[PDB]
Structure 1
């Protein structure tokens, strides 16, 4: 079982997540509580950490790429080896929820920045870059 990053169509993230859950897949779409200017007011908000993205935990052999895509609302999988769909590292996931020299420093600093970034679309990029970074380190190291 490994994690994956799905990007969802304009407004089907919610619907898709339900499906993949009715199917045995685990989904994770974090929200971030931020203080943004609503109407001249600094109102606290809860928005998606990273907009239309949805992490998915399933086993390639049991349900593979192919079928998870069919899930109504899923536009695509993020990919490292361009052919392969990417596996976020067990550690990239850890830092998302509760909270060596290159995994830690990539993940660490990476998420501090993601957690400080006012809009998610910008975070998405920062997450993707961080993921690409972390995967390379897993291989080369």
Structure 2
């Protein structure tokens, strides 16, 4: 009955959309990995998302409608395969929450290999789409 959707939030307001969604009793997830990247000085903990303007949400449409999510501040729209928003089961976000250092694990090793931010979130959507095809 509960549905996991993916939100292409507005550019530059990821944290604002996060707090606004958390205010509406909606479980929101932003994958977090620092990769120990190098800031202007030296290597530190940058703590940047997979790639910006991307969020995961869990909400039953019966209690809270998708129009409310669309009107939430900081978020632009969903991603809809065909004509309806993509359905996402719990396996992907279980794997994402558990592993925060199989095939998904090899995906994570890929993420740690390239650090190209667009590519990190790109392989993230690749893995989630692979699971969606499996489902």
- TM-score, normalised to structure 2's length? 0.80
- Give, in angstroms, the shift of residue 6 of structure 1: 1.0
Structure 1 window deviating more from structure 2 (79-88 vs 124-133): it is 79-88
Which stretches of structure 1, 4 residues or more, deviate above 6 A after TM superposition?
none
**TM-superposition CA deviations, 1:41-61 (whole Å, max 9, x none):** 333421113322111111122
Name the structure where strand makes up a greater proportion of residues.
1
Structure 1 window deviating more from structure 2 (15-24 vs 113-122): it is 113-122
Task: Show the 5 A alignment for 1:1-141.
Answer: 1-39=2-40, 41-99=42-100, 105-138=102-135
CA distance in 1, matches of 2:111, 2:55: 16
Structure 1 window deviating more from structure 2 (18-27 vs 39-48): it is 39-48
- TM-score, normalised to structure 1's length? 0.77
Tell me if the contact between 2:114 and 2:120 (Cα under 8 Å) persists in the aligned partners: yes
**TM-superposition CA deviations, 1:4-35 (whole Å, max 9, x none):** 21121111221111111111101112321222
| RMSD (Å), alpha carbons | 3.0
CA distance in 2, matches of 1:82, 1:106: 29
Task: Point out where structure 2 has 5 or more consecutive residues left out of the alignment.
Answer: none
